[PDB]
């Protein structure tokens, strides 16, 4: 029916980001209190992200689990 | 002490290039020089790279751009690769004949390294006299732009 026509749409899409630069990359701490010995731990990084509009890839294929959500047990 | 560790990346005609910047705070009585060098063994930095194999590189061994501490992931057109087929010696990579004409791609971890580009707030001073036989001069921490 719409062989020669112009179709216009409004759509909802899932949000996506990619990493353009890493800001305040590595932050550190020699945690020692209440430990057998000194330990090194990496504190949170900060990321500068950009949205994917010029190139778009579909959402990743995640392996599903058979566990039913909101399951009642007894 | 180090602050604001930054991995600034520039995408260019020549390729991608890393121009990171960071700020350091030092101990007392230490005088630093322009283009000095620091390295942090404890901290590891991830990188990715790809190399093309030919009949000559296979024998010589691939010259790696970055350094190496350990490898994380290896793959080619044939899929992943296993420890039985690849080995690394002196920061160059050797492969068996199975991958004579193939493109190998890697993800790698490397140790962190910095060099001194400029010295900021170089010299700070104090005439410490309290609880001393006599006056003494001491150099307070410098700040470094790496």
């Amino acid at each position: 029916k719409y062989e020669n026509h112009t179709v216009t749409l409004k759509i909802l899409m899932t949000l996506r980001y990619v990493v353009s630069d890493i800001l305040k990359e590595s932050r550190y701490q020699y945690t020692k209190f209440n430990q057998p010995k000194s330990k090194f731990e990496n504190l949170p990084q900060k990321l500068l992200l950009k949205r994917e509009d010029v190139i778009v890839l579909q959402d990743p294929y995640k392996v599903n689990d058979g566990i039913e959500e909101d399951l009642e047990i007894q | 002490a180090i602050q604001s560790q930054e991995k600034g990346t520039n995408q260019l005609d020549i390729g991608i290039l890393d121009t990171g910047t960071a700020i350091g705070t030092t101990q007392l009585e230490k005088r630093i020089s322009y283009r000095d060098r620091f390295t942090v063994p404890e901290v590891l930095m991830p990188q990715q790279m790809i190399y093309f194999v030919n009949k000559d590189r296979i024998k010589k061994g691939i010259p790696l751009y970055y350094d190496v501490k350990e490898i994380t992931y290896i793959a080619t057109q044939d899929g992943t690769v296993y420890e039985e087929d690849y080995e690394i010696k002196n920061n160059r990579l050797y492969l068996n004949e199975k991958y004579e004409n193939h493109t190998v791609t890697l993800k790698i971890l490397m140790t962190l390294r910095y060099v001194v580009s400029d010295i900021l707030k170089e010299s700070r001073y104090q005439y410490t006299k309290f609880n001393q036989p006599k006056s003494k001069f001491e150099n307070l921490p410098q700040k470094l732009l790496l």
Binding site: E68, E69, D70, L71 | -
Partner: protein, 48 residues
């Protein structure tokens, strides 16, 4: 007549509860209000 006693519990266990996402719909709704105090300027004083 009989004394009121608490009795035993009745709530069964639940595992892996999924969060609730608001559903998109073009239909109308009613926004549930809160009736309370309101803040405003004293516009008469501002003129002064």
């Amino acid at each position: 007549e009989k004394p009121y006693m608490i009795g035993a519990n009745s709530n069964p266990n639940v595992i892996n509860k999924s969060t609730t996402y608001t559903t998109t719909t073009q239909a109308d709704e009613q926004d549930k209000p809160k009736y309370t105090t309101r803040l405003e300027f004293d516009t008469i004083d501002m003129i002064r």
